[PDB]
Structures are given as C-alpha cells and as structure tokens.
Write a protein that binds this ligand. Structure first.
Ligand SMILES: CC(=O)N[C@@H]1[C@@H](O)[C@H](O[C@@H]2O[C@H](CO)[C@H](O)[C@H](O[C@@H]3O[C@H](CO)[C@@H](O)[C@H](O)[C@H]3NC(C)=O)[C@H]2O)[C@@H](CO)O[C@H]1O
Ligand SMILES: CC(=O)N[C@@H]1[C@@H](O)[C@H](O[C@@H]2O[C@H](CO)[C@H](O)[C@H](O[C@@H]3O[C@H](CO)[C@@H](O)[C@H](O)[C@H]3NC(C)=O)[C@H]2O)[C@@H](CO)O[C@H]1O
Ligand SMILES: CC(=O)N[C@@H]1[C@@H](O)[C@H](O[C@@H]2O[C@H](CO)[C@H](O)[C@H](O[C@@H]3O[C@H](CO)[C@@H](O)[C@H](O)[C@H]3NC(C)=O)[C@H]2O)[C@@H](CO)O[C@H]1O
Ligand SMILES: CC(=O)N[C@@H]1[C@@H](O)[C@H](O[C@@H]2O[C@H](CO)[C@H](O)[C@H](O[C@@H]3O[C@H](CO)[C@@H](O)[C@H](O)[C@H]3NC(C)=O)[C@H]2O)[C@@H](CO)O[C@H]1O
Ligand SMILES: CC(=O)N[C@@H]1[C@@H](O)[C@H](O[C@@H]2O[C@H](CO)[C@H](O)[C@H](O[C@@H]3O[C@H](CO)[C@@H](O)[C@H](O)[C@H]3NC(C)=O)[C@H]2O)[C@@H](CO)O[C@H]1O
Ligand SMILES: CC(=O)N[C@H]1[C@H](O[C@@H]2[C@@H](O)[C@H](O)O[C@H](CO)[C@@H]2O)O[C@H](CO)[C@@H](O)[C@@H]1O
Length: 402
C-alpha cells in the first residue's frame, strides 16, 4: 500500500533502489543510488540561496508530473508551482517551469503553518495530480499531461483549516487506499474520530465518514508528535491499516475493506512514551523489512535501532534491538540529522540510511530484518556546520526511476 503522510509526503517503493534528493543551499543535489555515489548539483534553484526558497514558506517534493516514470523536482513556491522535469540521462531541467499560479505562498495564500500540499496520482493515470488541504477544504489540480494543470478546484468542503477546523497541532491528514480499489482516499485523524473520504474516481472526494473512535486528541488522548500515527498495509492485501505509537505501545486497527475498521488492539508493548520514546529524540517508521508486503515497526531509540516484525496478519513479535547505531547514544538528534528506512538494494527489504553529522551512513538489510555493519556512503548531505541544516535544507529519499 503506497501511502502519503505529513512526515513522508513522498511514497518510496517497498522494492527498489531509493535515491537521495537534497534541496541544499545552492540548489538541488542528486545522490543517485549507484555503485559509486557521486552527488551533483542538478538544478540551481529550489534553494535557500538560489531562488529564495524557505522551509517556512515553501514545500519541496519529488513526483512524476509527466507520466514517463521519472521523478521530477516539484516546488510550491511564491507565485505558484515550479517543476524541473527529469530529462533522463541523469539531468534535470534548469530553469524550472511554473505549471500553475496557485498553491503558493503568494498565489493562493498558502501557509506551511495552516495547510498541507501533496502530489498524488489519485486518478491512477500514471502522473501526479496536485492535492492541497487548504482553507475551505480539499483543492485539486488535475494533471492533464504536458505539464498542463487544470485550475485549483475545491472538491470537498472538509479537512480544511476553516472547513471542519483542522489544525496541524491537533490533527493528521494522510492519503491512502482504505477501500481496496487501488485509489488513494483521504484519511483524517480529527478531534473525536478518524474519518475517511472516498476517492470518487473523478478527481473528487466523498463527504467525510467517521470510521474510528480512537487515535485522536479527544479520543484516546493521542497528541501530535508525542504519539505518532501511521497508515500502512499490515496484512498484504493492498489496503491501509492504521497503527499508532501510543503510551503503553503500538495500537492497530485493521482495515476490513471499504474503509471499515476492526477494533483497536495493542500489538506491541513498546515504542511508546511509557518506555521512554519521545518525539524530540526517537523517530519511528513503518517499513517492510522482509519483502512480504507487510509493514514492520522500526524505531530509532536511545541505544540504537529497535524492530518489531509483523507476523504477516497485523500481529507483531516483541521489539528487539537490531542495531547499535542511529540512536541518541550515537549522537543522533532529530533537530540536525535525518533518518530513513527504505529499500536501497532492490530486494524489497527496507534498509537504513542516516544523514548524520559529518557523513551519510548506511546499514543494509540481510533480507530478514537483521542489519549489517554501518558503512559511510558519502560526506555529502551531512549537517556539516549547517551546510545541510534542516532549517534551511530539505533531504528526501525518492525513486527517481518509477
Ligand atoms: C509586489 C511584490 O513585490 N511582492 C513581493 C513578491 O514579488 C516576492 O516574490 C518573488 O516574486 C518574484 C516576482 O516578482 C518571483 O515570483 C519570486 O519567485 C522566484 O522566481 C524565480 C524566477 O521565476 C524562480 O526561479 C524562483 O524559484 C522563485 N522562488 C520562489 C520561492 O518562488 C518570488 O519569490 C515576495 C518574496 O520576496 O515578496 C513580495 O512582497
Ligand atoms: C489571518 C486571517 O485572519 N486571515 C484569514 C484568511 O486567510 C482566510 O482566507 C481565504 O478565504 C478566501 C475567501 O475569502 C479563500 O477561500 C482563500 O482560499 C483560496 O481560494 C482560492 C479560490 O477562491 C484558491 O484558488 C486558493 O488555492 C485557496 N487558498 C487556500 C490556502 O485555500 C482563503 O485563503 C479567511 C477565511 O476566508 O479567514 C481570515 O481570517
Ligand atoms: C469538550 C471537549 O473536551 N472536547 C472538544 C471536542 O468535542 C471538539 O471537537 C469537535 O467535536 C465535534 C462533536 O460533534 C465534532 O466531532 C468535530 O469534528 C468535526 O466533525 C465534522 C462532522 O460532524 C467533520 O466534518 C469535521 O471534519 C470534524 N473536524 C475535526 C477536526 O475533527 C470536533 O472538532 C474540539 C474542537 O472543537 O474541542 C474539544 O475540546
Ligand atoms: C504512571 C501511571 O500508571 N499512570 C497511569 C497512566 O498510565 C494511565 O494512562 C493510560 O494507561 C492505559 C493502560 O493502563 C492505556 O495505556 C491508555 O492508553 C489508551 O488506552 C486506550 C485503551 O485503554 C486506547 O483506546 C487509547 O488509544 C490509548 N491511548 C494512547 C495514546 O495510547 C493510557 O492513557 C492513566 C489513565 O488510565 O492512569 C494513570 O494512573
Ligand atoms: C567542532 C566539534 O568538535 N564539533 C563536535 C561534533 O563533531 C560532534 O559530533 C560528532 O561528530 C563526529 C565527527 O567525527 C562524528 O561525525 C559523530 O558522528 C557519529 O560517528 C560515528 C562513527 O562513524 C557513527 O557511528 C555515528 O552514527 C555518527 N553519528 C552521527 C549523528 O552522524 C558526531 O556525533 C558533537 C557531538 O559530540 O559535538 C560537537 O562539539
Ligand atoms: C526510547 C528507547 O530506546 N527506549 C528503550 C529502552 O531505553 C533506553 C535505555 O536503554 C537506557 O538505559 O536509558 C535510556 C534513557 O537514558 C532509554 O530509556 O530500552 C528498553 C529495553 O531495555 C526498550 O524496551 C525501550 O524501547
């Protein structure tokens, strides 16, 4: 189940060779997954010191906007959305083209503090539409090919800042197939209910439906940051289940099809605030560590990397330390360093990659959820005196080849 969340707006293939994309100070640096990693400056734009880009005002992502199966550089900037197409041959277009005068800080009054902006193929046509949770609800710009985007259209008066009272500090809004039709639907962790809105197929979304009375700020006491929540396929049927890291551990509600969810159950007695897990220090992720199509729980704790394996049915084995690195004890801080759990080897078993203090480090999956010795991939993409500070730079893992 390919999903889109606030922390990871770019879906990464469970089986593939994830590339490094770094919106750095001077422009976009590409670290193509290859035998000899050689990061290069591809576009002199989308940057703090090239185009005047700011993490506080702008959004920078990767998506296939043309339908060639190549990942393009996309930037929600001031006057609109800019796209540097992947021209193949390891080159990106420079300068980019502005494909639409909306979804911008100036053009549209879009705010990182209030609104969300995603790129998703919600029509399943092979290229990414623009989907934004704005002021009055959900706005969609349909991708008509050739970088021609239709006007931003309000397709659902909900999940908005001024449409249902949605807040970044209280609520969560993801895209995921929860019905089982292969089409991304809207999933919203509101105040008292987890809601879903069905993808109607025509680029619009059905009125919100309350489906869970849990996983929310006023239903179970789930707080932003402290208790992270995730949409993921935990059974292998392609639908998104729901899993959160609460107080006493991880709670799961299983997708029973059509957006109907089973009862919320405690499946792992770990990864929660009761056992020291904190938002500021201990990032958690759902990834497939065994290549069976089921998401396992991965956590970067104090002493290093802990993993709880999925039994295959949404039930889990107990969490255990699998790596003595990438933790607090090894100098890792959320404020300065990045960490991702993605397949780098094409075996469908997620590997670990950390953008650390002075080097980008890696740990490969043996194919069964065990991890080998840490190797240094490059000196690039590391914090390095603020050369790659998260405040000014944005690092993503992405599949430039789709
Ligand atoms: C009336 C007025 O002066 N308003 C100010 C805005 O103009 C200003 O936005 C900057 O506006 C530029 C056009 O006047 C331009 O759109 C610029 O966007 C940048 O444009 C370049 C060239 O196309 C592009 O390469 C670059 O990527 C792009 N950067 C971003 C982030 O979009 C825009 O920033 C605004 C900010 O200074 O302040 C307003 O007062
Ligand atoms: C800080 C403050 O008090 N100001 C608030 C306004 O920011 C807020 O605004 C805006 O309302 C507009 C209608 O008067 C409009 O809905 C606007 O949204 C935008 O709508 C256009 C289409 O009409 C769309 O193209 C664009 O993408 C969309 N932008 C966003 C971000 O959704 C909206 O910002 C106002 C509520 O109306 O409340 C004020 O207090
Ligand atoms: C008193 C207290 O401690 N609890 C307050 C919450 O009740 C309150 O939440 C609002 O509760 C409503 C109950 O009828 C409702 O669930 C509302 O959620 C909104 O519901 C509509 C459909 O009815 C839906 O379209 C919309 O998307 C949804 N919005 C969200 C964000 O969930 C809910 O906000 C809360 C905020 O007022 O304050 C609590 O203190
Ligand atoms: C130090 C101490 O003992 N403090 C007590 C708290 O631990 C306790 O909080 C709650 O503990 C519950 C188990 O005893 C449980 O973990 C609960 O989490 C919530 O549990 C419900 C199901 O019971 C679940 O639906 C919900 O999703 C889940 N929420 C989260 C975010 O995990 C937890 O709040 C407190 C109240 O019982 O009492 C303290 O004395
Ligand atoms: C000017 C100065 O003295 N700065 C100090 C920082 O350098 C220091 O950070 C640590 O920097 C080290 C420089 O060699 C090193 O990069 C270290 O990174 C850790 O390296 C180990 C061994 O390869 C690796 O296993 C681990 O994963 C890795 N951790 C990270 C986050 O990359 C880094 O912690 C800082 C903390 O002591 O203090 C500064 O004063
Ligand atoms: C967040 C985390 O890693 N918690 C795990 C736990 O915690 C560490 C301890 O290993 C260490 O001794 O103290 C630090 C605080 O200074 C953390 O609390 O270790 C548990 C297993 O022993 C594990 O279940 C927790 O998830």
């Amino acid at each position: 189940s390919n999903v889109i969340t606030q922390d990871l707006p770019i879906p990464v293939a469970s089986r593939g060779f994830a590339d490094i994309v770094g919106f750095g100070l001077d422009g976009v640096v590409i670290g193509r997954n290859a035998v000899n990693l050689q990061p290069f400056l591809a576009v002199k734009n989308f940057a703090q010191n090239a185009g005047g880009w700011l993490t506080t005002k702008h959004v920078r992502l990767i998506a296939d906007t043309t339908g060639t199966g190549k990942g393009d550089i996309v930037g929600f900037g001031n006057a609109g959305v800019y796209v540097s197409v992947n021209n193949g041959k390891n080159t990106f277009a420079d300068p980019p083209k502005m494909v639409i005068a909306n979804f911008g800080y100036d053009a549209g009054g879009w705010r990182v503090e209030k609104h969300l902006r995603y790129l998703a193929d919600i029509r399943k046509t092979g290229r990414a539409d623009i989907i934004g949770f704005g002021e009055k609800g959900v706005l969609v710009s349909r991708n008509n090919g050739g970088l021609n985007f239709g006007p931003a259209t309000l397709v659902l008066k909900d999940f908005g800042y001024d449409a249902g009272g949605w807040r970044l500090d209280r609520h969560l809004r993801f895209l995921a197939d929860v019905t089982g039709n292969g089409h991304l639907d809207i999933v919203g962790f509101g105040d008292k209910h987890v809601f879903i809105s069905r993808n109607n197929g025509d680029g619009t979304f059905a009125p919100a439906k309350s489906v869970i009375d849990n996983f929310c700020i006023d239903a179970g006491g789930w707080k932003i940051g402290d208790h992270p929540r995730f949409v993921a396929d935990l059974t292998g049927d392609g639908t998104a289940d729901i899993i959160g890291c609460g107080k006493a551990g991880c709670w799961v509600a299983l997708n029973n099809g059509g957006g109907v969810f089973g009862q919320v159950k405690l499946v792992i007695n770990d990864f929660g605030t009761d056992k020291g897990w904190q938002a500021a220090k201990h990032p958690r992720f759902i990834a497939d560590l065994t290549g069976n199509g089921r998401g396992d729980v991965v956590g970067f704790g104090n002493a290093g990397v802990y993993v709880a394996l999925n039994n295959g049915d949404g039930t889990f084995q107990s969490a255990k330390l699998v790596l003595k690195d990438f933790g607090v004890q090894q100098g890792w801080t959320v404020s300065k360093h990045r960490r991702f759990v993605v397949d780098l080897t094409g075996d469908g078993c997620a590997d670990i990659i950390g953008f650390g203090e002075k080097e980008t480090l890696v740990s490969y999956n043996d194919g069964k959820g065990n991890f080998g010795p840490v190797k240094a991939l490059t000196n690039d993409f590391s914090f390095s005196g603020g050369k790659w500070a998260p405040e000014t730079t944005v690092c993503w893992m992405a599949n430039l080849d789709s």
